[PDB]
């Protein structure tokens, strides 16, 4: 968790929308087992990709306003923002290797 940005509905418009560079946003909730499984993978990705990527998390139960802005249907959903715009999307479970493939194709 040392490299994960904790987002809220109150901070999203600053920390994501006013940021240049790439930010991987994980939309999650505590009831979601696959979300909890990807959590340690995100710590590893945040470290390996530091300096070309920031990793952030938004809990959709605590912060219900953001996900509908992007039409999110279910979780996990990962949105890769580049300079305030969604540039890539991945839904559902992902292994480390699958997440690295997704990031490498988009960074
Ligand atoms: Cu950490
Ligand atoms: Cu490292």
Author numbering: 1 to 107
From the study:
Thioredoxins (TRX) are small globular proteins of about 100–110 residues, which are conserved in all living organisms. They participate in multiple critical redox-reactions via the reversible oxidation of the active site CXXC catalytic motif1. Two TRX forms were described in Escherichia coli, Trx1 and Trx22. The former, called EcTRX throughout this work, is a widely used experimental model for investigating the molecular basis of protein stability, folding and function.
The L94A mutation was introduced to disrupt the van der Waals interactions between Leu94 and the Leu99 residue of the CTH, with a concomitant destabilization of the global structure through intramolecular packing defects. In the crystal structure of wild-type EcTRX, two small cavities of 70 and 50 Å2 of internal area are localized near Leu94, which coalesce in a larger cavity of 183 Å2 in the L94A mutant structure. This effect approaches what can be expected from pruning the side-chain to Cβ in the wild-type structure. A decrease of the distance between loop elements centered in residues 20 and 83 is observed in this mutant in a similar manner as described for the N106A variant. We determined in this work the three-dimensional structure of three full-length variants in which the point mutations occur in the CTH (E101G, N106A and L107A), and one additional variant (L94A) where a substitution is located in the loop connecting β5-strand and CTH, using X-ray diffraction. The four EcTRX mutants were crystallized in the oxidized form, and numerous protein-metal interactions were observed as a result of the Cu(II)-salt added for crystallization, as it was previously observed for the wild-type variant. Notably, the four variants crystallized in different crystal systems, comprising monoclinic, triclinic, orthorhombic and trigonal space groups, for L94A, E101G, N106A and L107A respectively. As expected from solution experiments, the global structures of the four variants are mainly unchanged compared to wild-type EcTRX, with main-chain root-mean-square deviation of atomic position (RMSD) differences of 0.59, 0.48, 0.62 and 0.48 Å for L94A, E101G, N106A and L107A, respectively. We found that global stability of the variants is progressively altered from 8.1 (wild-type), 7.8 (N106A), 7.4 (L94A), 7.2 (E101G) to 5.8 kcal mol−1 (L107A). Previous results of our group showed that the specific activity measured by using the non-natural substrate DiFTC-insulin is 80, 95, 100, 108 and 175% for L94A, L107A, wild-type, N106A and E101G, respectively. For variant L94A, the drop was a 1:1 mix of protein (10 mg/ml) and reservoir solution (100 mM sodium acetate, 4 mM CuSO4, 18% ethanol, pH 4.6).
